[PDB]
Design a protein around this ligand. Structure first.
Ligand SMILES: [Ca+2]
Ligand SMILES: [Ca+2]
Ligand SMILES: [Ca+2]
Ligand SMILES: [Ca+2]
Ligand SMILES: [Mn+2]
Ligand SMILES: [Mn+2]
Ligand SMILES: [Mn+2]
Ligand SMILES: [Mn+2]
Lengths: 234, 234, 234, 234
C-alpha cells in the first residue's frame, strides 16, 4: 500500500492556516516565515520560534514494514548585525505530532537539558560545548550533539538553498546547502534509522533561536518550502 | 505566488492520524474507510460519518486575487441488502476547517434544516422532496438541493471510480463516475464560484448517512483517495 | 516502475518534442493547428497529426506490467457552416513509427485492407456509413468503427476540455468532454485490452481531418495538453 | 509553462525511449551498461552514451523563459585495479542531434578543433593534462576542462547516488554525490548560463568511456534515473 504527501509554497500567506506557528514565529506581510523576533528591523535576543505543517506525516508502519522516503527543499536567510556575534541557529526537523518548543539558545528550540524524539538538520551559528569550533551543518538524532557535521561558511544575509533527502532502503539522510550568490556548497550525510528514532507519525517543519545575550542576535527567515514523502512497500 | 498540496492513499491505515474521523466513521483493519456503521456484516440505520484531511487547503486569496484549481479521485462502494430500499448516500465535500457533522438521513451529514457553507458532489441513493425521482449524482452549492444533477445507475456493491475537477479560470466543477465492472459512466458539470461559496481555507473529505428506518440501509465505503490543489496567480 | 509526464499550457512554434505530420503546425499564438486554414478559413482535404517525441511504454511482458495513463487537453472545432461539418479530431496511441493513414472519414488514423494498430478516442463530426447518425465521441480499437460511443453535442468554436484515463487493473478506458462555457458534459467508457491491441511501446498524440468536399470544412485546434503514464507492478 | 518528467527505477532491455550510442546497452537485469564488458571484465577503448528520446526545452527567447531542472540517478564504476582507472562517466545536455565525440579522456563528450555545445557533470577517474591531480567531480561548459571541480573519493564497485539541480533564476548548477554504503558525500556548484552555452532544445543523458590502455579499465553502469524540467515565466 502507498501513502504520499506533497506540499509546496513559493511564499507563505500571512495567516497560514496549514502551518502551526509556535513561540515567536510569524509570517510577515510580504510572506516571509520569520521564526525569531524582529523589532524595528533588528533581531531580538532570547527568541525561539517554530513552524510545523498541519498534517502529520506517516513515516513508518509496523503493521506492514514500510518506512518512508522523503525530500524537502527550502531557502533561508540568517542576517546578523555583527558577523562576529551570531547565535544560535535554524533547523529543519521531524518530531511527534504534539511536539512543543523546547529549550532556548544553543538547544535551538528542539532539545532540552531535562528529558526527546526529534531528528533534525541544523544550521548552527554558535559553538556550544557539544559543538565543533566552527559554524556547521549537522545531522541530529535525538540529541543536540550532531551525529555528523560539515563545516559551514555562513554568508551573512545571503539566501541559502537547502535540499534534504532520506532514502529509506539505505537509511541515508543527506543535507546540502548552496549559496547561489557565490556558487559555494556544503553537504553532509549520515546513516539514520527513522524507525527507531521517531514514532510512526510525525510533524515536520522548522525551529530557530537567537542568542541569549543582547549582542548575539541574528534573523532566521524561511523564504519558501517544498516537502514530499512516500510510504510504500519495501 | 504558488501554494500546492497533494496527497494520495491507495488504502487507509487503520489508525490514520492525517484523517479527522467524525460521527460513526472508521477505518477497517483491511484499510477501508467505512463512513457508516456495519454490525456483523450488515449496515445499520441512523448512521452518519465523515472524514476530513488534516491539513486545511488554501482555496482562495483576497489579498492576491488567486483562486485554486483542484482535482480528486476516489473509489467507493455502496452495498445494500435490499436494492429497493437504499438510503441515503455518500458525498465528497469542501467546508470550513472547523466543520462538524450536520443533519442525518437525506441531509447527508452536510446540511441541516436549521441554518451552512459547503460545496459537495453527492451520490444520492434516495429521493427526498428536494430531489429528482431517480438516484443521481449532484453538484451542491450551500444547499442540499443540487444545482445540477445527472441520473445515476447505481450498481449494488460494485466499485465506483470517481474523478472530480475544478477549473478556477472557467469556474467549472465536473464530476464523473465509472463502473469498471460494466464500463458504464456518468458525468455532470456546473458553473461554481468557490470564492463566494466558501471561506479562503477549507477542509476536504467525505460524508455519508444511512437511512432512518431499519429497512433503508446500505454501506458507504471509500477504498482509496487522491487529492491535489493548486493556488496560483491568474 | 517507469513514469513519464509532460504538460504544455500552450505550444511553442517549431516544437522539437512534437513530431508534426501532414498539415499540422503550431501557430505564433501557440495553438496546435492540426488542419489547414488559409485566409481565415478551414480548407478541405486537410490531414494533420502531432505525436510526442518519446515513445511511451504501455505494457511489458517480461514483468507483466501494464500502464495506467491519463491525458487532458482542450480543443476547438470551428465551422463556417453548422450543418456541414467534417471530419473530426482524435487522441490516439499507435506504434512509434506510425504514419498518416487515410484522410476524410478515416481521420488520418485508419484505412479500409490494412491491419492497423491504433487505439483512439475520436470526436467525430460527420456521420459516415460505419458511424451512428449524430456527432459522437467514440472509443476505437484498431478500426474506424467505434466499439462504443456517446452522442456529442458539438459546440461551434467553443473550448472543449477533455480528460481520458485508462485504469490497467480493470482495462477500463474512459473519455470525458466538458464545455466550460456551457457546463455541459459527455462521457463514454469501454473495456479495452491495450496489451492485445497495441505493441509494448507507442507514440501518443492527435490526428484530425477536414472534409473532402469544399463545403464540409472546419478547424481542429489543440490549445494545451498534459499526459502521464505509469508502468508498475500490478 | 512546459514541464517534462520521467523516472525509471530500472531500465528495460531494448528501451525505445532511450537513444543508445556506441557500446551502450541495457542488460537483462535492467542496468544501463554504458561501456563494454566481456567475460566478466571491463574492456578498453569503449565509449557508450544514452539519451532520453524527447528533447527538452531549456530556454525560450520568445518569452524569456529559462528552465530549472533536477535529475537523480545511481551509478557504479567497478575496476579490477584500484590504481589503474579510466576514464569516467558524465551526465550531460547537448543539441538533439548530438553524436559521440572523442573516446578516452574526452568521455565521448568533447574533442580537441571542434566547437561543441555540451554542458556536463563529469565523474572523472583519470587525471589527464587538463585535469587536477586526483579523481574529481567537475562542471564542464563546452570544454573538457572543468570550470569548477571538487575532489571525489571514488568507491570501487559501490552504488553512488547523484543529484543535480539547476536553478534558472540564479544560474546555479549544483551536483552532489553520496555513497549510501558509506554515508560519504561530495558537492560542487557553479554559475552556468545555459542560455549562452546551449541551444533552446537539448537531449539529456549519459556518456562514459574506459581507458585506452588495456590495463586502465572500469565499468560505467547506471542503475536508475529520474529527470524533471520546468520552463516557466520567470
Ligand atoms: Ca550551537
Ligand atoms: Ca436524497
Ligand atoms: Ca465520421
Ligand atoms: Ca580525465
Ligand atoms: Mn551544533
Ligand atoms: Mn440529492
Ligand atoms: Mn465515428
Ligand atoms: Mn576532468
Amino acid at each position: 500500500a502507498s501513502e504520499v504527501v506533497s506540499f509546496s509554497f513559493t511564499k507563505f500567506n500571512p495567516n497560514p492556516k496549514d502551518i502551526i506557528l509556535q513561540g515567536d514565529a510569524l509570517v510577515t506581510s510580504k510572506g516571509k516565515l520569520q521564526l525569531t523576533k524582529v523589532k524595528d528591523g533588528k533581531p531580538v535576543d532570547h527568541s525561539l520560534g517554530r513552524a510545523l505543517y498541519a498534517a502529520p506525516i506517516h513515516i513508518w508502519d509496523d503493521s506492514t514494514d514500510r518506512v518512508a522516503s522523503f525530500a524537502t527543499s527550502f531557502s533561508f536567510v540568517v542576517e546578523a548585525p555583527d558577523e562576529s556575534k551570531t547565535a544560535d541557529g535554524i533547523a529543519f526537523f521531524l518530531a511527534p505530532p504534539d511536539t512543543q518548543p523546547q529549550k532556548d539558545g544553543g538547544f535551538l528550540g528542539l532539545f532540552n537539558d531535562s528529558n526527546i524524539q526529534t531528528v533534525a538538520v541544523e544550521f548552527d551559528t554558535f559553538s556550544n560545548t557539544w559543538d565543533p569550533s566552527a559554524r556547521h551543518i549537522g545531522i541530529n538524532v535525538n540529541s543536540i550533539e550532531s551525529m555528523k557535521y560539515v563545516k559551514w561558511g555562513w554568508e551573512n544575509g545571503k539566501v541559502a538553498n537547502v535540499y534534504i533527502s532520506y532514502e529509506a532502503s539505505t537509511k541515508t539522510l543527506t543535507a546540502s546547502l548552496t549559496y547561489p550568490s557565490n556558487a559555494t556548497s556544503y553537504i553532509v550525510s549520515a546513516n539514520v534509522d527513522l524507525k527507531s528514532a521517531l514514532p510512526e507519525w510525525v510533524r515536520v517543519g522548522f525551529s530557530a533561536t537567537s542568542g541569549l545575550s543582547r549582542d548575539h542576535v541574528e534573523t532566521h527567515d524561511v523564504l519558501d518550502w517544498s516537502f514530499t514523502s512516500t510510504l510504500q512497500a519495501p
